[PDB]
Design a protein around this ligand. Structure first.
Ligand SMILES: CCCCCCCCCCCCCCCCCC(=O)OC[C@H](COP(=O)([O-])OCC(O)COP(=O)([O-])OC[C@@H](COC(=O)CCCCCCCCCCCCCCCCC)OC(=O)CCCCCCCCCCCCCCCCC)OC(=O)CCCCCCCCCCCCCCCCC
Ligand SMILES: CCCCCCCCCCCCCCCCCC(=O)OC[C@H](COP(=O)([O-])OCC[N+](C)(C)C)OC(=O)CCCCCCCCCCCCCCCCC
Lengths: 74, 253
């Protein structure tokens, strides 16, 4: 069972950035497709920037957990 | 802004494809004085060595009869004079001022032998040396630096401002300006790119011919004006020299 647990954890930590980049991207794309005015766009630019920062945070977390999971003593 | 300077040299500049570079500094930034409109606190400060100036100051004060000023200035200036960096007057400018305002050849030669050729006098030095106000000396230095504004001045470095709002507005700009078929139009390809490219190519190929053909008249006018000024001044001078000896008639009588 430990092998299954480990592979689950590894795959989750590996796909975390892909999710942050793809599904939240689809949400942003829905919003872009639906919005027309200028005030809402001005306010949504900051959401896009926050998504940038969140993607970088997820990438850092994944890097940390992956260097923990792929570190061998011998 | 007015064009300050006492020079009659008609000067134009040609540009390169490289930007001006200055030595790295973590606290200062170089900029144009007229474009920045800086203040005394925006100017950057530094420490200058006193002794070479304090010796001449002691001499001048012993000559004029005011030693309290020297003592006060020396006690203020010890451990170096902290002053704005790009607010100064050159030795040549100062000597010209002295000569045209009537300081004796002895004093001028003292200045020359005392200070190097590349020395730079600042407004506190000028004030303590001529018994003037630092405000007036600062204004004079600023005018003399604006007369030569090709030289950049060193200000305190400040981080950019309003980056978040600027990002929002630039996003709005692109969102409203690129959601169109303007850069792919038949009008674009038929008029905007051809006319613009032809103008650019002609300007790049005849860049200098155009400038010369335009500046010919101004150069001729400036030459004419200078020649007239010179000839008139010379004639008046020589005539007054002729008539200079018309005062001894009285003391002869
Ligand atoms: C008729 C029908 C239509 C009617 C509806 C109209 C709708 C209008 C909506 C209101 C918004 C108007 C547009 C302006 C937006 C603000 C732009 C801006 O200033 O940003 C630049 C701002 C300044 O930064 P900078 O320009 O880079 O550098 C300058 C420094 O920051 C230095 O900056 P500073 O010193 O000048 O100020 C700093 C300030 C900057 O913080 C801000 O962003 C300001 C936001 C204030 C919004 C107030 C809206 C008022 C109108 C609505 C009324 C709501 C009731 C509340 C009333 C206020 C009292 C609490 O705060 C801080 O940075 C942190 C310190 C906090 C200090 C205390 C601040 C609060 C002061 C007390 C309130 C003052 C009220 C004034 C009276 C108004 C009378 C009309 O930086 C930001 O961008 C902040 C983030 C942007 C905000 C959005 C964040 C993402 C959330 C998006 C929303 C969700 C998406 C939309 C979906 C919504 C679905 C429901
Ligand atoms: C032990 C090992 C640990 C490994 C850890 C791995 C975790 C991090 C993995 C994330 C990889 C993500 C990279 C692929 C996504 C970008 C694809 C792309 O290049 O688009 C074409 C980009 C953008 O092109 P574009 O948007 O201008 O137009 C064309 C785009 N296409 C072709 C897609 C239509 O090409 C570029 O010109 C990019 C040049 C700028 C540099 C961009 C790279 C920085 C941004 C990504 C950083 C991610 C790594 C962060 C690591 C942080 C670690 C602390």
């Amino acid at each position: 069972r430990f092998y299954f647990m480990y592979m689950a954890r590894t795959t989750f930590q590996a796909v975390r950035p892909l999710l942050a980049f793809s599904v939240f991207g689809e949400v942003m794309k829905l919003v872009l497709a639906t919005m027309s005015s200028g005030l809402f766009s001005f306010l949504f630019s900051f959401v896009l920037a926050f998504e940038v920062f969140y993607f970088f945070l997820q990438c850092y977390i994944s890097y940390t957990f992956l260097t923990m999971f792929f570190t061998v003593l011998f | 802004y007015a064009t300050l300077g006492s020079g009659w040299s008609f000067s134009k500049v040609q540009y390169t494809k490289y930007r001006i570079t200055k030595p790295w500094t973590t606290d200062t930034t170089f900029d144009d004085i007229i474009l920045s409109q800086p203040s005394k606190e925006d100017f950057a400060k530094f420490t200058k060595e006193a002794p070479l100036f304090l010796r001449f100051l002691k001499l001048v004060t012993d000559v004029e009869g005011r030693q309290e000023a020297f003592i006060q200035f020396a006690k203020r200036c010890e451990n170096g004079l902290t002053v704005e960096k790009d607010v100064y007057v050159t030795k040549k400018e100062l000597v010209d001022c002295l000569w045209k305002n009537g300081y004796t050849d002895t004093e001028i030669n003292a200045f020359e032998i005392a200070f190097p050729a590349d020395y730079k006098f600042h407004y506190p030095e000028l004030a303590v040396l001529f018994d003037l106000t630092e405000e007036d000396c600062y204004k004079y230095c600023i005018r003399q630096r604006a007369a030569t504004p090709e030289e950049l001045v060193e200000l305190k470095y400040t981080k950019p401002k309003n980056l978040v709002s600027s990002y929002g507005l630039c996003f709005l700009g692109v969102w409203f300006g690129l959601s169109n078929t303007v850069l792919s139009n038949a009008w674009f390809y038929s008029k905007t790119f051809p006319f613009g490219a032809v103008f650019y190519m002609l300007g790049s190929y005849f860049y200098r011919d155009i400038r010369e053909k335009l500046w010919k008249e101004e150069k001729s006018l400036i030459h004419t004006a200078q020649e007239n000024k010179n000839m008139g001044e010379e004639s008046v001078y020589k005539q007054m020299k002729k008539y200079a000896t018309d005062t001894k008639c009285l003391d002869y009588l």
